[PDB]
Ligand binder design. Structure first.
Ligand SMILES: N[C@@H](C1CCCCC1)P(=O)(O)O
Ligand SMILES: [Co+2]
Ligand SMILES: [Co+2]
Ligand SMILES: [K+]
Length: 304
């Protein structure tokens, strides 16, 4: 394999971490290939669940706990900390909240969160590499509680970064928030990509095509598929009671991705940096409830 940038995986990985049996487990947790029969049973359907009030309570709780876990990870970000160390802390924080770390064994993903450094677009695997001053790192958290998943991520600075990193991460965050600000009943899912690409392109960045936002609730990934690029063909119309994520990946160079031999790590083909932010959103009768928002602080960690 020809690496696209300066990053390399740092093996070996620690043996998979167990989750105590008292924590409730999603269907894929015990499938040998980590397949989710409940997701597969709805493959290729574009119908979107309308959440009940019990379903809304469950999503509110799990998304609030997921934010708490992201915040734990944010508190660990500094030069010298390895991504596996971050993942270990995340793992324990999930368990402390009686939640299962959704990514763990999801189609055999080996860790409890994703850590994506510099040219890693998404799904980086936590490993023995210490964070370097100047790096940018996304931690993506997903938790499962009482049958509901909640999903969010943020990109962080490691010590001091360069202006390019500041601009990339800021614009990325703005893309997410401009899309969120448009969410309300009656908006076509396909419109979000128009808004995202327009701001990314105005700042000289591209928009990753291969990965989309997604419905989320009882299933981790389900309808709707939410592309983040312009003139996409996403199916469907927002309605009060819909829950889904938006998670734009924006890159300094070109939009093309490829995947490491590990089967997960997605990297820019040119080796230039990518940034991402994600929230889980509930469409209300008039707008959007950001289920994964911070409750106690005005801004994302990188602006704090
Ligand atoms: N949270 C991410 C996943 C969740 C399942 C395993 C891989 C990481 P996403 O759905 O790509 O935002
Ligand atoms: Co995520
Ligand atoms: Co997601
Ligand atoms: K990255």
């Amino acid at each position: 394999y020809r690496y696209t940038g300066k990053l390399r995986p740092h093996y070996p990985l620690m043996p998979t971490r167990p989750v105590p049996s008292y924590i409730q487990r999603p269907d894929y947790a015990d499938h040998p290939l980590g397949m989710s029969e409940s997701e597969q049973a709805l493959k290729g359907t574009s119908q979107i669940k309308l959440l009940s009030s019990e379903d809304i309570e469950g999503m509110r709780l799990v998304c609030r706990l997921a934010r708490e876990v992201l915040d734990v990870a944010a508190g660990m970000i500094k030069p010298g900390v390895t991504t596996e160390e971050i993942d270990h802390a995340v793992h324990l924080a999930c368990i402390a909240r009686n939640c299962y770390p959704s990514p763990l064994n999801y189609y055999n993903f080996p860790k409890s969160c994703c850590t994506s450094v510099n040219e890693v677009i998404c799904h980086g695997i936590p490993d023995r590499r210490p964070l370097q001053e100047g790096d940018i790192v996304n931690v993506d958290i997903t938790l499962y509680r009482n049958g509901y998943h909640g999903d969010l991520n943020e990109t962080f600075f490691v010590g001091e970064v360069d202006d390019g990193a500041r601009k990339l991460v800021q614009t990325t965050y703005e893309c997410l928030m401009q899309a969120i600000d448009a969410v309300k009943p009656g908006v076509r899912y396909r419109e979000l990509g128009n808004i995202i690409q327009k701001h990314a392109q105005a700042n000289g960045f591209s928009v990753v095509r291969s990965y989309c936002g997604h419905g989320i609730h009882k299933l981790m990934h389900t309808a709707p598929n939410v592309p983040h690029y312009a003139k996409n063909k996403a199916v469907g119309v927002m309605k009060s009671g819909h829950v889904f994520t938006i998670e734009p990946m924006i890159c300094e160079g070109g939009w093309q991705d490829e995947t490491w031999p590990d089967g997960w790590t997605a990297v820019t083909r040119d080796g230039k940096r990518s940034a991402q932010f994600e929230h889980t959103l509930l469409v209300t009768d008039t707008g959007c409830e950001i289920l994964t928002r911070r409750l106690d602080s005005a801004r994302p960690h990188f602006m704090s």
